[PDB]
Amino acid sequence: GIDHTSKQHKRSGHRTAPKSDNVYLKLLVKLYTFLARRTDAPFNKVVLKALFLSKINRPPV
Amino acid sequence: ANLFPEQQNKEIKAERVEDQKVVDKALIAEIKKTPLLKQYLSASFSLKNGDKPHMLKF
Amino acid sequence: VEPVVVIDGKGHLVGRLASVVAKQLLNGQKIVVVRAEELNISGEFFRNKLKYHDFLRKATAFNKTRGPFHFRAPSRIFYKALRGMVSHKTARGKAALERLKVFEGIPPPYDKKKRVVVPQALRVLRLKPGRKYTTLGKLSTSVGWKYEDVVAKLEAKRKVSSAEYYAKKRAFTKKVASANATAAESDVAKQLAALGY
Amino acid sequence: AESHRLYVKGKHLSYQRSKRVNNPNVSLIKIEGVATPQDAQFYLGKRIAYVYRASKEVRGSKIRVMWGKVTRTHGNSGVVRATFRNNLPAKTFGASVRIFLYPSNI
Amino acid sequence: SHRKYEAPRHGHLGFLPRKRAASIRARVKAFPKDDRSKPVALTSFLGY
Amino acid sequence: ASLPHPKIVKKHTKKFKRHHSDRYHRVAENWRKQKGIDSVVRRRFRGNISQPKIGYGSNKKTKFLSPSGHKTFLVANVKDLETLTMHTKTYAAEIAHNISAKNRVVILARAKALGIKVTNPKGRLAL
Amino acid sequence: MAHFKEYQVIGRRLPTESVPEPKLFRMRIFASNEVIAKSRYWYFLQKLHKVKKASGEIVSINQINEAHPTKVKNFGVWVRYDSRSGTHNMYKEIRDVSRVAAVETLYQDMAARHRARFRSIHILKVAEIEKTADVKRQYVKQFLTKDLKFPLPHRVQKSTKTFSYKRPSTFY
Amino acid sequence: VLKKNPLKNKQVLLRLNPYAKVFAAEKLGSKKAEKTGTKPAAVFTETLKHD
Amino acid sequence: FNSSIGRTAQGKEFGVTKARWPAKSVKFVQGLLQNAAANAEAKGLDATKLYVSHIQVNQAPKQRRRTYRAHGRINKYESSPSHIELVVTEKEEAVAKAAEKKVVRLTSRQRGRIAAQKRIAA
RNA sequence: AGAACUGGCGAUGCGGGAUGAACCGAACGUAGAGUUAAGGUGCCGGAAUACACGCUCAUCAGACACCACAAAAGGUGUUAG
RNA sequence: GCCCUGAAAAUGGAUGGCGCUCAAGCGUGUUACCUAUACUCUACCGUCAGGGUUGAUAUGAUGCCCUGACGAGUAGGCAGGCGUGGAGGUCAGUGACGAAGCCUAGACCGUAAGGUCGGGUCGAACGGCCUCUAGUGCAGAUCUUGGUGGUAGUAGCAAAUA
RNA sequence: UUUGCUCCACACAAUAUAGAUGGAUACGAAUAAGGCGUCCUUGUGGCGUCGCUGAACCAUAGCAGGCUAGCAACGGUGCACUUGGCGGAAAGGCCUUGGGUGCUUGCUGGCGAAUUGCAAUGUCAUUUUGCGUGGGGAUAAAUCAUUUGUAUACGACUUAGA
């Protein structure tokens, strides 16, 4: 018996990978998961997280 | 497992037997010092109707 | 510690007894109650009579037959007051009740053999010296039992046949007691004396 | 000479239970003579064995066995909880069982 | 709702059940109280 | 030849039959959760068929492992069989039910000279 | 309750700017431990002066052992018990071996003869009545005669076993 | 992988608070006290023994 | 199949109370037996040791027919037929034994006792 | 019948309240060992026919919350005051 | 205070029952003892979360691994899976030396939907994986159609003289 | 019906166990009273003693108990006979006389035991029955059908029939 303060098993809410099956785009990701986990640079973390965004979050710059 | 049960054809080692007496005699000479100890030993054990091993003493 | 615990009934108090006798059955111990008409009950006579009369009017409406049978025989009374104290509807309960045997007086088998007593149930080890108790045989007779006399007659016979046995045993105990008196003071008797005997 | 009991007469009472839920995983035995939790302690561990007779003969006997072991005191009247390789039958509530004196501490 | 007009029940209950008696010879449930003082006389008989 | 497998436990062995799969012959023994509003089995009462919870999942270490610490793999023909030329200790070749009495014997012959454990080495072995 | 302990707890409100060193109040409380003692302290205190745990403090809380823990004495008592009806004052006498046990016998006598829980019971005047004749109740005036003596009819030897073979005597 | 607590494992009990090596030999937790037995005021006793 | 059927004394030798005398049921059975006894002869068997071993009669396709019940409703009038079949067997004697020898698997301390026992006696 | 706050029930099993949607305890993956809650420990039934102070006799005893209702008024019954 | 009285209702009847009277009652204090899916430790599952980790002449970085927490749930939402008909691809898949189907208190896998095997029966097609697709999964619907019971060898086959 | 049926002593197979594993070891009555011994002037007596549990008494040492030699006592004692008696509350048991026969751990000897290998109930009770031994004993009925009417729905009941 535990009085949960928070809603149990929150699925985080953020993306863990691109919902696409774009083989090449999935390569960049495997390339960046690495960079964002070894280089330590804040840059890769943002770029990596940025590949998982849908076409409505990757506006045409 | 092919004879089962066709007696012994394997009993004892004459050695083990002699080694008994080699010691038996030694203790036997020790038992005839304490009265009834030979009888107490040639006697088996058993619990009686109204024998309590916890409130007992050995 | 014996295969059958023949239990004397005189003095005992129904409930109290009924309970221990009931636990001894549901433990495997076989039991046989004797002199169930010398069995006592708490409260005065008139109360235990009304209580039987308030149970005597409890029968099935549409058929007084399939109704709660009201046994008047002291053995069956004490028994009905022991049934409710066992899960008699299950096989285990049906089984424990086949280890029990409640007799009026003391029949032929359970008379040549020693009967014991249960202190935790006995009247003169409970009832505060002064409170009015009740004898079963007395009540039963006043509610349908028709063999009050027959027993008083038989036990009277057995009590004299038994009193004669004990008189022989009275002198036979004193007999061996007198041989044990002179056997003492001897070198083998004083050997055990120090060995706690 | 006439007696050869190297164990004690225990009676399998009922399984550990409540008012309406018995847990067969544990039994309750009323050992002969024992009546206190202090003097009950001397029976703990003592491998228990319920001996019964079967009709069909197995490896060589018509009398199979159920092994157990006292696990702890229980209550205030010298009763003890026992467990077996295979829990007891239930058809054995009021069945004389055997409490050996091993593993012996004395 | 009550009976409306209380009336004696039909039949005697202590005469039940109204089943066909076991044997044609009515058993004699009880015999006269024994009188140990009189001659050893008989108590019943079998007529037709 | 089976790799050292931990003691295979099951937690629950008794199959999970639909509720009342006994009462009516129409209600197949195939499991089905009772959607009922009054369903005692769904409300989970004291003494009704234990429903299949996920907690009955088996140790990932021993999941799919048959009694002989071998995961069973269906085998069609010999070509298909040689997939276990390098896993004679982890898998067991299970000859399919549509394999002829003549072909089965060829597969077994190959599986014996390869050291594979065929689970059904008795399929259509009419003397 | 358990085996009481006549605790000694003194309190004294709290050192305020205007009234430093306030007149200490000593209460001769009864309980089975210390916290029950303190609670019971304010409890009675706040029933006399405008003082409660929030405004005061517990000076010292020493236990009080009996003077002659083996000297059988007579006791006088005055109790302010609130019965279901209302509340009454009374004087019972319990001749025992200590204040602590005589008050323990009292409380259970308060539960037996007048069904009053420790909570509806206030213990007033409680001291050892010196000479006899000062004993206002006959039930105590009883055991106070020239070299008394009495038997114990019908001894009830409690059995260890379930069965006996010797049907029970009650001689003493 | 296992929370082997101290209190009933002298080996871990020393893997933390190495002072349990010295505490051992020194005894400490049982070391006697000084009998600086003074005296309580006469007032204390007459107020503690009041009516 | 006896619910509401009448009672009769002739049903005592069997232990029941209900027993009817199905004249038709019998004529078709003793009539078919006639055929069984005859097959046994042309097969060359003992007309004496012969006894019925297996006789099984089961439902047949019900002959359909109708009946008119009040308010012009048509309730069926099925004719439940049979499919009798039996087997008259020659009665053989000696049930025989032909028991299994039973391979004994006794432990070493289970043999030991047998060895120590047949060591004091025979 | 209708509102307030909170908790529940609904939707929620489980141990106790014999029994019961709502009360006591307590919230559920599957197991094992320990310890308890609630409630209980004469027997049914696991657990003391344990300890201690007392009170009680009812020819209509009494028996533990929600809960299975009882009063105003009486008693030289008895106990204490 | 306890107790008595005040205390009357309909089937027999309920401190749960038996039974209990220095109680097994009423009041109280003391212990020990008992056992829930709760609490404690541990194992396993799953979910979630936090991380670790391309690594070389190997095979899945939607991988492996470490770490902590948590698990009730109708209406309901979503996710991951199982199954059925048919479609593209694939296993140069299975098969008259027996496919499919059906039977099997015979075996194995999976929590499960289900899958798998042996035996029986049988006679002409069929399955796994990757995708596509839908008239795709039944215990109800006084459901439809058909079929079969208990009822039951029962009601009853009794007007019109035979 | 070919010798079927039954009782005893066994012999071996089947059979199960609500559960042997030293001994259920007999006054009565009372309990604010009793038991026991004993004494006389026999009582509701005197005197002594006892209890506070059976934690007693009995049994009990021997290959689950073997083979021999005695010593001392003539006791104890098991089985099977035998004499007389008692018990009908379910007597089916208790008591007794005398032979017999085996043992006797009351005392002293001498041999044996192992390898069941460091435990595995480690198998020794009594229940029922069957099939084969040979040893005694005994040679029926019921039901249907017929019949009757004191009976009756049917069964049942009541009669009758070599």
Curated annotation (Swiss-Prot), chain A:
Subcellular location: Cytoplasm
GO biological process entries: cytoplasmic translation
Keyword entries, A-Z: Cytoplasm, Isopeptide bond, Methylation, Ribonucleoprotein, Ribosomal protein, Ubl conjugation
Phosphoprotein recorded as keyword: no
Modified residues (N6,N6,N6-trimethyllysine): K49
GO cellular component: cytosol; cytosolic large ribosomal subunit
GO MF terms, alphabetically ordered: RNA binding; structural constituent of ribosome
Functional description taken from the UniProt entry: Component of the ribosome, a large ribonucleoprotein complex responsible for the synthesis of proteins in the cell. The small ribosomal subunit (SSU) binds messenger RNAs (mRNAs) and translates the encoded message by selecting cognate aminoacyl-transfer RNA (tRNA) molecules. The large subunit (LSU) contains the ribosomal catalytic site termed the peptidyl transferase center (PTC), which catalyzes the formation of peptide bonds, thereby polymerizing the amino acids delivered by tRNAs into a polypeptide chain.
Subunit structure: Component of the large ribosomal subunit (LSU). Mature yeast ribosomes consist of a small (40S) and a large (60S) subunit. The 40S small subunit contains 1 molecule of ribosomal RNA (18S rRNA) and 33 different proteins (encoded by 57 genes). The large 60S subunit contains 3 rRNA molecules (25S, 5.8S and 5S rRNA) and 46 different proteins (encoded by 81 genes). eL18 interacts with NAP1.
Family: Belongs to the eukaryotic ribosomal protein eL18 family.
Anything else known: There are 2 genes for eL18 in yeast.
Protein name: Large ribosomal subunit protein eL18A
Curated annotation (Swiss-Prot), chain C:
Protein location: Cytoplasm
UniProt keyword list: Acetylation, Cytoplasm, Isopeptide bond, Ribonucleoprotein, Ribosomal protein, Ubl conjugation
UniProt cross-link Glycyl lysine isopeptide (Lys-Gly) (interchain with G-Cter in ubiquitin), position: K175
UniProt keyword annotation of Phosphoprotein present: no
GO cellular component labels: cytosol; cytosolic large ribosomal subunit; nucleolus; ribosome
Domain of life: Eukaryota
Gene3D superfamilies: 1.20.5.4280, Ribosomal protein L13 (3.90.1180.10)
Post-translational modification: N-terminally acetylated by acetyltransferase NatA.
Alphabetical GO biological process terms: cytoplasmic translation; maturation of LSU-rRNA; negative regulation of translation
A GO term for molecular function: mRNA binding
InterPro entries: Ribosomal_uL13 (IPR005822), Ribosomal_uL13_CS (IPR023563), Ribosomal_uL13_euk/arc (IPR005755), Ribosomal_uL13_sf (IPR036899)
HAMAP family: Ribosomal_uL13
Subunit organization: Component of the large ribosomal subunit (LSU). Mature yeast ribosomes consist of a small (40S) and a large (60S) subunit. The 40S small subunit contains 1 molecule of ribosomal RNA (18S rRNA) and 33 different proteins (encoded by 57 genes). The large 60S subunit contains 3 rRNA molecules (25S, 5.8S and 5S rRNA) and 46 different proteins (encoded by 81 genes).
Family assignment from sequence similarity: Belongs to the universal ribosomal protein uL13 family.
Note: Present with 43300 molecules/cell in log phase SD medium.
Name of the protein described by the UniProt record: Large ribosomal subunit protein uL13A
Organism listed in the record: Saccharomyces cerevisiae (strain ATCC 204508 / S288c) (Baker's yeast)
From Swiss-Prot, chain E:
Cross-link (Glycyl lysine isopeptide (Lys-Gly) (interchain with G-Cter in ubiquitin)): K38
Disruption phenotype: A mutant confers resistance to trichodermin, a trichotecene toxin produced by plant-pathogenic fungi.
Compartment annotation: Cytoplasm
Cystine residue pairs: none
Domain of life the protein comes from: Eukaryota
Phosphoserine PTM sites in chain numbering: S23
Residue spans crossing the bilayer: none
Summary of subunit composition and partner proteins: Component of the large ribosomal subunit (LSU). Mature yeast ribosomes consist of a small (40S) and a large (60S) subunit. The 40S small subunit contains 1 molecule of ribosomal RNA (18S rRNA) and 33 different proteins (encoded by 57 genes). The large 60S subunit contains 3 rRNA molecules (25S, 5.8S and 5S rRNA) and 46 different proteins (encoded by 81 genes). uL3 forms together with ES39L one of the contact sites for the signal recognition particle that targets ribosomes to the endoplasmic reticulum membrane.
Note: Present with 450 molecules/cell in log phase SD medium.
Family membership noted in the UniProt record: Belongs to the universal ribosomal protein uL3 family.
This protein's name: Large ribosomal subunit protein uL3
Organism: Saccharomyces cerevisiae (strain ATCC 204508 / S288c) (Baker's yeast)
Lineage of source species: Eukaryota, Fungi, Dikarya, Ascomycota, Saccharomycotina
Full protein: residues contained: 2 to 49 of 387
Curated annotation (Swiss-Prot), chain G:
Main location: cytoplasm
GO cellular component, one term: cytosol
GO molecular function, a single term: structural constituent of ribosome
Modified-residue entries (Phosphoserine), positions: S32
Alphabetical keyword list: Cytoplasm, Isopeptide bond, Phosphoprotein, Ribonucleoprotein, Ribosomal protein, Ubl conjugation
Cell compartment(s), UniProt: Cytoplasm
GO BP annotations listed: cytoplasmic translation
Domain of life: Eukaryota
Pfam family, one: Ribosomal_L18A
Protein purpose: Component of the ribosome, a large ribonucleoprotein complex responsible for the synthesis of proteins in the cell. The small ribosomal subunit (SSU) binds messenger RNAs (mRNAs) and translates the encoded message by selecting cognate aminoacyl-transfer RNA (tRNA) molecules. The large subunit (LSU) contains the ribosomal catalytic site termed the peptidyl transferase center (PTC), which catalyzes the formation of peptide bonds, thereby polymerizing the amino acids delivered by tRNAs into a polypeptide chain.
HAMAP family (alphabetical): Ribosomal_eL20
Family: Belongs to the eukaryotic ribosomal protein eL20 family.
Additional observations: Present with 54300 molecules/cell in log phase SD medium.
UniProt name for this protein: Large ribosomal subunit protein eL20A
The organism of origin for this protein: Saccharomyces cerevisiae (strain ATCC 204508 / S288c)
